[PDB]
Amino acid sequence: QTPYKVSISGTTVILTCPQYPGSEILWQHNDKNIIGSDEDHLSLKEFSELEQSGYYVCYPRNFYLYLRARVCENCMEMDVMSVATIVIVDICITGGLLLLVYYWSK
Amino acid sequence: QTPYKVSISGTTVILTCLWQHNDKNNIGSDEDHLSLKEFSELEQSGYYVCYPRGSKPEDANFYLYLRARVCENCMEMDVMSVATIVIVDICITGGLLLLVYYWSKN
Amino acid sequence: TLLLQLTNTSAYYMYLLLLLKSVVYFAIITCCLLRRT
Amino acid sequence: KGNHLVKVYDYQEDGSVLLTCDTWFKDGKMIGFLKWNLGSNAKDPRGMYQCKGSQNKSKPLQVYYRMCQNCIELNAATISGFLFAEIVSIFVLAVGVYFIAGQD
Amino acid sequence: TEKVNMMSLTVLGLRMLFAKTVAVNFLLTAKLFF
Amino acid sequence: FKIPIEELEDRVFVNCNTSITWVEGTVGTLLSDITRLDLGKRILDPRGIYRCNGTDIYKDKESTVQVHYRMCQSCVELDPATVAGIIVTDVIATLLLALGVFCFA
Amino acid sequence: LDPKLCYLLDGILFIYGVILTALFLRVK
Amino acid sequence: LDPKLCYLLDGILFIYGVILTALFLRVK
Ligand SMILES: CC(C)CCC[C@@H](C)[C@H]1CC[C@H]2[C@@H]3CC=C4C[C@@H](O)CC[C@]4(C)[C@H]3CC[C@]12C
């Protein structure tokens, strides 16, 4: 019932199985042992969608992972607000600096 | 030896070296010229060959590959013209501003 | 989406030109201001 | 087959083009070393490529990529705006310098 | 696709800088008269 | 047990031969037909945990497939050259404005 | 995306203009 | 259509701001 976590940052992609947080877990892709594994998670790079984008299962020595992602290097997402507040905070800080300089210089 | 020279002007693509594409003997196919209009990306691409008579076309020196899209009256520049435009604009603005400044000092 | 990017890259050159052209007026003002004061 | 062993990789929806054959040379010079990656199509790749195997020096083939993301518009609906904005800004700066010089 | 977004963000940044530069020049020119 | 994921030109769907329960994530739109759900538009970043049982010949075995889409159409690709170039000139412009305002007083 | 770039700067600029006019009309 | 109207609004409102700043400066 505990959902999988995944953070696709740049080209390296992280996949973790938090079902067994007190041990180390192996990894397969279409029942084939698999670029490398980690202590608990998957550190994978040079991602592609045509290959290496299928069903993943973690197993120690019925919760299955299937994902697809168009990995884009040094490249993330931002909605309207995440860029709408940047101009607001810039205006706020420049106004604060202006007011401080004006008031301090009598 | 010399690669074929192609310099698209507007929607007109011009290429020269016979001329075939996937050996299938609008599209302007001339005996010593090759030009092509409405260069859509989906339907007009692939491989091109310059082969002479008396030979099966798979002995040409080297191939071609085009994946160009073209809009209506759109032209692109490397960094040669942008510097030219910037410098000519700066010269014009400096000359006019200096002239109107000297006219001001009456 | 091609037309929007086309217009956007048209406007970017406009604004770079305007900034680089306002820089010269800033430079001509600052010389006179320094000479005066 | 047919002494044209170089075959560019197609059917790629990503911003990355691939070239392969069944070391490498750029314009006949030693730049490549070893499916050798070529680069992204946004940067408008060019050059001359070479692959060879058991058989001797194979026969080249070039790739033209035109993908610009830099082309601008040049019809009357845009040149009018450019001229208007440039002339208005020039007039404003001229008025400003005129007045300025009035004080001095 | 994923490149037009920077083209749209950079033009907004340049608009911001244009406003800032015009404010600078207006303030300096106004001060010169005093 | 695998949960096949079909994909048409512009549709993403979930199929089983039994009832499938949406417990966490995004369900998309409510559909009354059994043993089938419609996720929706391909460009929506659909995410969720979907719980689908087995068929009649595979009774009493549960399968849970985590389906995650990251096909972003509102994502921005950044290069260090442009953002640094604009941030440095913004900083220098702001410093200058402050200087001017000060001089004014 | 275009509406965002339309509204974001023009709101602040518009407000500026209004607050400037109001002051000018009040002084008059 | 939206980007062109957007830039037109930017320009017109900017000119209005400049002229109103001048008028406010003179009256004070
Ligand atoms: C971006 C800039 C260059 C646009 C032009 C603005 C500058 C150069 C001009 C435009 C209007 C001008 C102002 C118009 C009227 C007055 C009132 C007068 O009693 C003192 C000078 C003063 C205050 C002028 C100073 C210079 C001024 C502010």
Dihedral (CA of F47, F50, F55, F59) sign: positive
Domain ranges of chain C: 6-37
Backbone phi, psi, residue B90, to 5°: -65, -45
Pick the residue of C7, C10, C30 with the most D CBs within 10 A to test the interface with D by mutation. C10
Contact criterion met (CB below 8 Å) for F95 and A94: no
Tally helices (H) and strands (E) across chain E. Answer: 1, 0
Q: Please count the structural domains in chain E.
A: 1
Resolution (A): 4.0
For chain F, what are the domain ranges? 1-105
> CB-based burial of residue A64 (10 Å sphere; 0-12 exposed, 13-18 middle, 19+ buried)?
middle
- How would you classify residue F48: left for phi > 0, otherwise alpha for psi between -120 and 50, otherwise beta? left
3 state SS of A85: helix
Query: In the PDB record, what is the listed experimental method?
Result: cryo-EM
Q: In angstroms, what separates the C-alpha of E28 from chain F's closest C-alpha?
A: 7
Q: Which chains touch B (3 or more CB pairs under 8 A)?
A: C, D
Alpha-carbon distance D31 to D72, whole Å?
34
- The answer to whether D103 contacts E33, with C-beta atoms less than 8 Å apart, is yes
The answer to whether the CB of H28 is under 6 A from ligand 1 is no
Distance CA A104, CA F102 (A): 9
- Smallest CA–CA distance, residue C8 to chain E, in Å, is 6
Contact C18, E21 (CB under 8 A): no
Q: How many CB pairs under 8 A join A and G?
A: 8
- State whether E2 and F100 contact (CB < 8 Å): no
Of all protein residues, whose CA lies closest to atom 16 belonging to ligand 1? Answer: H26
Round to whole Å and give the CA distance between G10 and G17.
Answer: 10
Question: Who contacts A104 (Cβ-Cβ below 8 Å, separation ≥6)?
Answer: none
Q: Which of B56, F56, F74 is nearest to G1 (CA)?
A: F74
Counting one residue from chain B and one from chain D, the pairs whose CB atoms sit within 8 A come to: 79
**Cα–Cα distance for residue pair C10/A59, rounded to 1 Å:** 54
Six-digit token string for B84:
């030219």
Question: Do A and E share at least 3 CB pairs under 8 Å?
Answer: yes
| Structure-token pair, residue A20 | 């067994």
Residue closest to B40 by CA, chosen among B82, B85, B77, B70: B70
Q: Is D36 helix (H, G, I), strand (E, B) or coil?
A: coil
Using an 8 Å CB-CB cutoff, list chain G residues near H24. 20, 23-24, 27
- How is residue A33 annotated by DSSP? B
Residues 6+ apart with CB under 8 A from B31: B18
Strand pairing of F63-69 and A63-68? parallel
E32 lines ligand 1 (CB under 6 A): no
What are the chain E neighbours of G2 within 8 Å (beta carbons)?
8
Q: Do C26 and E21 touch (CB under 8 A)?
A: yes
* Nearest by CB: B89 against C17, C25, C28: C17
DSSP bridge pairs for A43: A14, A36
Is there an interface between B and E (3+ Cβ pairs < 8 A)? no
Of B13, B65, B48, B60, the C-alpha closest to D63 is B65
Q: Is the CB of D92 under 6 A from ligand 1?
A: yes
Closest chain A CA to residue G1: A80
Gyration radius of chain D over CA positions: 26
Q: Are β-strands D61-62 and D48-49 bridged in parallel, bridged antiparallel, or unpaired? A: antiparallel
**3-state SS assignment for residue B76:** coil
